[PDB]
Design a protein around this ligand. Sequence first.
Ligand SMILES: *[C@@H]1O[C@H](CO)[C@@H](O)[C@H](O)[C@H]1O
Ligand SMILES: *[C@@H]1O[C@@H](C)[C@@H](O)[C@@H](O)[C@@H]1O
Ligand SMILES: [Ca+2]
Lengths: 94, 190, 254
Amino acid sequence: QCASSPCQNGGSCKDQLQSYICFCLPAFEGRNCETHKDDQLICVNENGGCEQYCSDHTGTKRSCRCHEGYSLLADGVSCTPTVEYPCGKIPILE
Amino acid sequence: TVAAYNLTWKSTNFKTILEWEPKPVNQVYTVQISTKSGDWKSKCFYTTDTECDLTDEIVKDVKQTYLARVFSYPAGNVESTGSAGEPLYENSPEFTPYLETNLGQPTIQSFEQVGTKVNVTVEDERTLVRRNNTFLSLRDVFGKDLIYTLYYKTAKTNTNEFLIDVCFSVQAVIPSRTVNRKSTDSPVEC
Amino acid sequence: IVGGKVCPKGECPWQVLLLVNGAQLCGGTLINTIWVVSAAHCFDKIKNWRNLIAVLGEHDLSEHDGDEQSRRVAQVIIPSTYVPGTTNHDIALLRLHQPVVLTDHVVPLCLPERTFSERTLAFVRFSLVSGWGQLLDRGATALELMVLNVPRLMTQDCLQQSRKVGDSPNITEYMFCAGYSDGSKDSCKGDSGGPHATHYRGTWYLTGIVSWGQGCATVGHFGVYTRVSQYIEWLQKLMRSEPRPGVLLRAPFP
Ligand SMILES: *[C@@H]1O[C@H](CO)[C@@H](O)[C@H](O)[C@H]1O
Ligand SMILES: *[C@@H]1O[C@@H](C)[C@@H](O)[C@@H](O)[C@@H]1O
Ligand SMILES: [Ca+2]
């Protein structure tokens, strides 16, 4: 049943009654391991991995941005307060 | 724009897929899945497929109950009910992997026929559940919850091994299950 | 707040208490040193505007520790599509006469970008509503700040789970419901105008405003809030532009 090698991207196949099951490598998902995890850096997906603001760009990588009172860090995703009392932070807990 | 319907969970060995209908006529879908009080997480963005592999999300806690919902969009878009100003969606049934996933058809591996007795052993088959990039086995996930059942008239064990005396098919079983209690018969051997 | 907890002092530092003549009116949220966001319907009666007052850093209403700051409210701006007595478009923006001073105890809530708010914050499940309103549908208003965590619902779920009622208003695209329908936990009268606030990776963001209600903690119903994401660019054009004369202002919306 696995005989047609349907798991793409390096995955293993284990045949079942009336079908199969693909065990994917870490970076892949999908019935047939056809779905590229590395490959959906978009804003509607966990916020583009941005800490605050996400901008999708035509043809290029999404960029992250920050609220006022905040500036973007080296890693390109995190924000850091640039002021004393940043909005939406609780100083008693900070 | 049409709402998905007949949303169903197809799951074996924790490998988990949600399927629904209809096949998209100028519309795409996105799935959201979540535990009963987690945030929602998107998968399968703007697909024209009518299925979504949710295995990665559900194996993160197999004892939780998950709800998925599937959104429909035009063309085109990105908006909206109109009406409520949100995407049209529809909800899956609830799903609790540890209790509903189909046990995969096991496979007998070993038949050493020692004395007056044959010792037929069943294989601890790997599941889609990972710990550290590597895959846990049926025994790792179910422990004392999983027993087996031999036809050879019938026997039974709760280890991965039987032992009888002077044909052979098995059966994974989780007795505490309200549903999908019994696996399917291993391919018959001797 | 029905069914909540006392918010420990300074853990809701953007909480505003609105008073007229020294009497409780409403909640509000501090979004910067001079701008507070509230609920339009709180201003439906208001005899003398001279004394509108906002209190910041307030916690225990019955006495007076370091932290409170009071300001006359210079202007109340409400959308021009809000109709007194009805439920739609229940947002007000208030200009304080002088800025408050930010301290441990007084801090603005982030007014998020709209598409961040539609896309990410709308799917964070739990958010906090807070206030000094009634602790039960017919009961006593609170005296220490109450806080409650409710789950948000998409409107289709809201419409599906709620008992139908003769003449209950439409849940519009400017509204959403979060709360429980088993009758245990809700926002209540006098919580109006304050915040439903969403925590996302370490920073908190207005997502909603307490608005209206079939009673409070009524079996079969959820709390309804104003969907702040619809009014973000309205809020911002108003904060950026030039002060106009008058106390109540009806500003065009969109
Ligand atoms: C490869 O072959 C299997 C059956 O062995 C088939 O169902 C797959 O769809 C195909 O790609
Ligand atoms: C089977 O398991 C999968 C995950 C991959 O390791 C394959 O290379 C292997 O054959
Ligand atoms: Ca006090």
